[PDB]
């Protein structure tokens, strides 16, 4: 709200939107860029947000500010966009910040789910997949929320270097984020004895 000689936030709606699979593959992993728009399903509605309420553009992912004992991160925008002043009016401003975070993930027996460093639960087995009978592993999400890419080469966002050895990349779109990790067979990877 733009009053006389002062401005006040009537509201700040903050949301986390998953990056679609095609954007993770074609834009982030291939070119190190994100779309300036966020199009996603929230509250049973398809919603589209435009950064600075402008047309869609490709924006470069840059390293986040260094923090102690913190993993690597990248983002596109560091400033929040607020609407320009118009006196005696309520105005709205949209900020879209594409964020990529390398995180540690932990799973306890029987490994039907795992957690991320952010504290977000993923209700899918870390070993879920399409091969070696891993399709029988637990999943809570719909089939279209999961994707598995064979022969995936990870391109580093900082050094811009393509990975030498391919991996099997699991991608899962939760309602808040998309999580990608390397698929490995369960039996050689975990044990109940140490």
């Amino acid at each position: 709200w733009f009053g006389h000689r002062y401005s006040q936030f009537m509201g700040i709606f903050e949301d986390r939107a998953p990056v679609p699979f095609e954007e993770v593959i074609d834009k982030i992993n291939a070119k190190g860029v994100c779309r300036s728009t966020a199009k996603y399903v929230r509250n049973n509605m398809e919603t589209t947000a435009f950064h600075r309420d402008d047309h869609e553009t490709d924006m470069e992912l840059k390293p986040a500010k260094v923090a102690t004992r913190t993993s690597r991160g990248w983002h596109t925008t560091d400033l929040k966009y607020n609407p320009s002043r118009v006196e005696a009016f309520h105005r709205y401003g949209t900020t879209v910040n594409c964020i990529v975070e390398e995180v540690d993930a932990r799973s306890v027996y029987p490994y039907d789910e795992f957690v991320l460093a952010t504290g977000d639960f993923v209700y899918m087995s870390p070993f879920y997949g399409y091969r070696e009978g891993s399709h029988t592993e637990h999943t809570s999400y719909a089939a279209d929320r999961f994707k598995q890419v064979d022969g995936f080469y990870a391109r580093d966002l900082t050094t811009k270097a393509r990975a030498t050895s391919p991996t099997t990349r699991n991608l899962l779109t939760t309602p808040k984020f998309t999580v990608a990790w390397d698929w490995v067979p369960k039996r050689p990877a975990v044990c109940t004895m140490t």
């Binding site: 986040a64 500010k65 923090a67 913190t70 991160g73 983002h75 560091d78 400033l79 929040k80 607020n82 910040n97 964020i99 460093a117 952010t118 504290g119």
Partner: peptide, 19 residues
Amino acid sequence: VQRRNQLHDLRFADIDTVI
């Protein structure tokens, strides 16, 4: 988790600049 989540603005945003 609290430590890493409360560093979010100090990593991905700017808390000082006034437009």
